[PDB]
Amino acid sequence: MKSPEELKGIFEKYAAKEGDPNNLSKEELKLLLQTEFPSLLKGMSTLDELFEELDKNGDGEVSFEEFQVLVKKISQ
Amino acid sequence: MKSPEELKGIFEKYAAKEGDPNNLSKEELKLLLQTEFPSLLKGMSTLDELFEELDKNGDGEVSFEEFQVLVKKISQ
Numbered sequence: 001m002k003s004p005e006e007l008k009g010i011f012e013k014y015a016a017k018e019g020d021p022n023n024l025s026k027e028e029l030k031l032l033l034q035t036e037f038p039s040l041l042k043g044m045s046t047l048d049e050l051f052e053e054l055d056k057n058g059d060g061e062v063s064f065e066e067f068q069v070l071v072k073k074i075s076q
Numbered sequence: 077m078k079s080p081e082e083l084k085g086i087f088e089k090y091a092a093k094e095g096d097p098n099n100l101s102k103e104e105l106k107l108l109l110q111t112e113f114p115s116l117l118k119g120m121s122t123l124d125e126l127f128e129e130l131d132k133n134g135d136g137e138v139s140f141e142e143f144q145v146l147v148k149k150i151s152q
């Protein structure tokens with residue numbers, strides 16, 4: 001549905017709301033998605049997004065180096 | 077409290093189960109988390125992990141260049 005040029009507009013609109021007007025805080029990302037793409041977060045799974053966050057080179061595997069980003073999250 | 081040596085042993089135990097024995101697939105990561113850190117996925121939100129995936133330099137702001145990762149996933 002949306003084009004990449006539209007998405008540039010969208011990024012600029014919501015990034016200007018608070019703080020640095022050229023960058024998106026977590027609160028502005030939440031408002032962007034709730035307003036423009038409200039079904040994006042209910043289709044996503046947390047496990048799938050953690051895996052994408054860890055797998056930086058996109059080979060479908062988490063190496064021991066890449067696992068170090070998960071180790072930072074563990075409470076202890 | 078888990079030491080660093082213990083976390084290395086956990087990584088190696090679950091990485092060896094399937095396929096490449098030195099790297100973790102998503103199915104092995106699922107088993108590792110359900111067994112060793114069961115509340116971790118329960119406590120995470122999809123939005124929080126999507127933000128962390130996009131915020132590559134960890135300054136808590138997503139720049140337009142960081143945002144492009146999401147643009148390529150949802151737009152043509």
Ligand SMILES: [Ca+2]
Nearest residue numbers: 015018020023
């Ligand atoms: Ca902003």
Ligand SMILES: [Ca+2]
Nearest residue numbers: 055057059061
């Ligand atoms: Ca990888």
Ligand SMILES: [Ca+2]
Nearest residue numbers: 091094096099
């Ligand atoms: Ca493996």
Ligand SMILES: [Ca+2]
Nearest residue numbers: 131135137138
């Ligand atoms: Ca950033």
